[PDB]
Amino acid sequence: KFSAKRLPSTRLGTFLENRVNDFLRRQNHPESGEVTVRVVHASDKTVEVKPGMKARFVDSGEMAESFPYRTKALFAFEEIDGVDLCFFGMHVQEYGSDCPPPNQRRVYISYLDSVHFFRPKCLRTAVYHEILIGYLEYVKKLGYTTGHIWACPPSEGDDYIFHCHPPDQKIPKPKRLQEWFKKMLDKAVSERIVHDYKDIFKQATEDRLTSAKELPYFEGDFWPNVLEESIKELEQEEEERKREENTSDLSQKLYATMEKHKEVFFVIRLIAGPAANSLPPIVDPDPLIPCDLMDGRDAFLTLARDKHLEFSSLRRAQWSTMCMLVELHTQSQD
């Protein structure tokens, strides 16, 4: 059997699905089916400081040239009338205790995606929250101190993970997406999983950061590109001053930019104050899962496009869930 349940399991994937099914049992709703969570990719990577953060900090020896992270893809599946449906997927970036500041002990959500067919409707949002609470809960226990989310809906016609969302599934605007993360984080705060959370701006002022080198540097994320565009304009300014002399602050505009966009960037403190000082090293009990299809989001979108897998309705998304699963299974074999 190529079913989702039979996919090789993980501490992490298991933790998640256990949490959700407990929550589902407590709800005791006749239409809900069993949920399955599987990490289908885990591998070790680096993020490279782009040129010009490179120039200004790396070469100076003030900041490391790259940071190592593990990357992971996990999908949640619900069983509807005895048939697997993949309604949710997420890609995270985890930076262990073995990683250079600013990035150590931080997790980042690269992207997350869903298709709105989970049943019943009235539990869909709850379930996604639960998945997220549990993830934050898991990495906290491994000793990651801080989660990071950038609340960034996809551009129109663009797919984060699943190819061809249903024409009527609305895409939230930023304010709504913000409120949605807030409602999730409050629940994790009341459960004492999260200490507190703040926008990037407030957080950076509190941490009293004086320099861009201090800002966590993540793959695909906004700030490494902002800094680049900022040095780029910081350079054009210098060239403008160059002319005035007759020749052919970085952290200032960082703070300006941070303030302007602050609402859309979450910093989530899992462990604050005393504990984060001295911690045993981060030990991931789960194995590496090489999977070519699940490294980044583009492989599976290519496959989807190539093989015409759409998630555009419950019936297609199930068929797609089928192929996705078969592939994951045959691509797992010798």
Ligand SMILES: CC(=O)CSCCNC(=O)CCNC(=O)[C@H](O)C(C)(C)COP(=O)(O)OP(=O)(O)OC[C@H]1O[C@@H](n2cnc3c(N)ncnc32)[C@H](O)[C@@H]1OP(=O)(O)O
């Ligand atoms: C960069 C990252 O990946 C991390 S930031 C997350 C951004 N990811 C995405 O935008 C992926 C595409 N979006 C999604 O998969 C979902 O929106 C996610 C983020 C999973 C949320 O799912 P939900 O829990 O259903 O929240 P949401 O979208 O806000 O939808 C709940 C209600 O919010 C309404 N709604 C959503 N977008 C709307 C809109 N644009 N206009 C009006 N109403 C909207 C929905 O019609 C829906 O109404 P109802 O069915 O309860 O009657």
